[PDB]
RNA sequence: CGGAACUGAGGCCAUGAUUAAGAGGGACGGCCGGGGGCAUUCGUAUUGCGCCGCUAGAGGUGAAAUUCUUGGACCGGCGCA
């Protein structure tokens, strides 16, 4: 975890893959390639209370603690690939998503170019429910 | 000289055929259209597999457990199905 680059003239980039689901939050640091990882760490290690791991309070706290540890490793710049569950399923990030986001706003990492990358299908397989739907 | 069938060539008849339906059928001209059938091409995602990377949780709920998981899960990359 040592970028030999000089600090400001140019950045040694990593790339954080921020998964924000409605029941989990991943954080997966990698190289420019992506194939090689530096540090991945999740919330579920840091907080053990099933009901409020995806809670926005939990996802924020998680994002701060995780981003803190990656900064700790000393990577100055990051590419970003925020991602949600996707597919035939939901296209909206869950309640953790946004608390994590604001948390990473205060956390301090130098940010390269951002992009969205949730895998939307052209034409999809059937959603997990009835025809009559998740009813309640 | 009268009355039935058959058979030749005339003269004349203003010589003979109602219109073409804001009824209809059929033809023609270039169009029009997720109209039909057959064959052909493409896309991602998907779930599955194989391989590589870090790793201890992952799942899922209003809240939890059976469930998968240090015999390497989930996450990421490349190929295949």
Question: Which nt is closest to the CA of A87, judged by C1'?
Answer: B45
Q: Is the CB of A90 under 7 A from strand B?
A: no
Distance A123 CA to B42 C1' (A): 14
* Distance, CA of A54 to CA of A125 (rounded, Å): 26
Q: Which nucleotides of B are covered by protein (CB under 7 A)?
A: 43-47, 52-65, 74-78
Tell me how many helices (H) and strands (E) chain A has.
Answer: 3, 5
Beta bridge partners of A13: A77
Within 13 Å of residue A90, how many CA atoms lie on the same side as its CB? Answer: 12
A63 within 8 A of A103, measured Cβ to Cβ:
yes
Experimental method reported for this structure? cryo-EM
């Amino acid at each position: 975890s040592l970028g030999p680059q000089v600090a400001e003239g140019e950045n040694v980039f990593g790339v954080c893959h921020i998964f924000a689901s409605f029941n989990d939050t991943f954080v997966h640091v990698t190289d420019l390639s992506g194939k090689e990882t530096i540090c991945r760490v999740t919330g579920g290690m840091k907080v053990k209370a099933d009901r409020d791991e995806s809670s926005p309070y939990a996802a924020m706290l998680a994002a701060q603690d995780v981003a803190q540890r990656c900064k700790e490793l000393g990577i100055t710049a990051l590419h970003i690939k925020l991602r949600a569950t996707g597919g035939n399923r939901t296209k909206t990030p869950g309640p953790g998503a946004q608390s994590a986001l604001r948390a990473l706003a205060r956390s301090g990492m130098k940010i390269g170019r951002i992009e969205d990358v949730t895998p939307i299908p052209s034409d999809s397989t059937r959603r997990k429910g009835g025809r009559r739907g998740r009813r309640l």
